[PDB]
């Protein structure tokens, strides 16, 4: 079987389950957490389960982790403007931490839907080209138009061999 | 191995495939230097018809002549394909019948 505990974490589908897409301001996220203590349990889970998803959805944000440097776990976000955002995470479950960061620094569903609609415009259905970029290679694939000579020979009157 | 070891070692590196007597080519042209017979390895007994040929690559190699009866002589041009002769150790080339000087086997 797949090695390690919770191998589902190492599947693309789980990695794409992440619902936190940081705004463009966020550059760095530091995660200070403690290896022992019940009050930091959620933070530990946040490192175990959700940091991979956050990194997957935010490949250009620098995520760094720190262990047993402070009595209390916390998150810090550095923004492009130079601002710092501190999030205390004692007594908070990993899900609560995810919701908090999504609310304060995550793009809303409206902005994401706008981005997908913008992405849609790039692939105009009316263009003709290779399958990698377009739905159809040629107009001859459209019913009612003259089909390929490869699949249906043209009449002699439309071929140059019989016109020259 | 652990995940760290698999990461450090990386994807398996399949060694490059070994080139055979034809050097990765379907056939090779050759010039017959001498014709002779060789005896099989012994669960079997026969006098297998073989010829030494200088290939277009310059290497000299032993080839097996299939069929009943051949008219190959020295300085004649032949085409040799791959395929081991299972009885003869070290013979890994076979003369193509019906190409250049080597004619097709005479009927009966």
């Amino acid at each position: 079987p797949m090695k390690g505990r919770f191998p589902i974490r190492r599947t693309l589908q789980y990695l794409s389950q992440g619902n936190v897409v940081f705004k463009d301001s966020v550059k760095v996220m530091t995660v200070n957490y403690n290896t022992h203590g019940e009050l930091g349990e959620g933070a530990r889970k946040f490192v175990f389960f959700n940091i991979p998803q956050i990194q997957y959805k935010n490949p250009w944000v620098q995520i760094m982790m720190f262990k047993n440097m402070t009595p209390s776990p916390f998150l810090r976000f550095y923004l492009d403007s130079g601002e710092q955002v501190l999030v205390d995470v004692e007594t908070k479950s990993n899900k609560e931490i995810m919701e908090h960061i999504r609310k304060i620094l995550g793009k809303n569903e409206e902005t994401l839907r706008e981005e997908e609609e913008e992405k849609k415009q790039l692939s105009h259905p009316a263009n003709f080209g290779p399958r990698k970029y377009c739905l159809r290679e040629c107009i001859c694939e459209v019913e009612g138009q003259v089909p390929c000579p490869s699949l249906v020979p043209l009449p002699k009157e439309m071929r140059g061999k019989y016109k020259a | 191995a652990t995940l760290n070891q698999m990461h450090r070692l990386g994807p398996p590196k399949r060694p490059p495939r070994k080139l055979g007597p034809t050097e990765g080519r379907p056939q090779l042209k050759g010039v017959v230097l001498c014709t002779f017979t060789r005896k099989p390895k012994k669960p079997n007994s026969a006098n297998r018809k073989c010829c030494r040929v200088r290939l277009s690559t310059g290497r000299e190699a032993v080839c097996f002549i299939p069929g009943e009866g051949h008219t190959l002589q020295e300085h004649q041009i032949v085409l040799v394909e791959g395929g081991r002769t299972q009885d003869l150790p070290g013979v890994k080339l076979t003369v193509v019948r019906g190409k250049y000087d080597c004619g097709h086997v005479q009927k009966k």
């Binding site: 263009n127 040629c138 107009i139 390929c148 | -």
Partner: protein
Amino acid sequence: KAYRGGHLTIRLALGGCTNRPFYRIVAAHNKCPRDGRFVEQLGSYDPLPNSHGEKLVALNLDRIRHWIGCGAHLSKPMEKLLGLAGFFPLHPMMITNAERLRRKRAREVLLASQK
């Protein structure tokens, strides 16, 4: 790729098969090959009448206006297509060729009458 000089131009790139032409209206660098790299596809043109007896022309008018406003040139066939669509004035040569064909048909009719 850096070309010495050159400009963008909206032109017709030929695809399809032997004796079955089809055109893509594209904005591309003039030095690029006819059916090679382009900047954007701005429409299509099927010169063969379909089962309904129509020649189908698709024009991305918004993007055509954008690229003309960005300094793109137009090939003569594209100018003639835009004139036929009513987007541009009729090109002078459509008018002149129509007049020439009228005169030729008049000469043929006069020959028939003379005979």
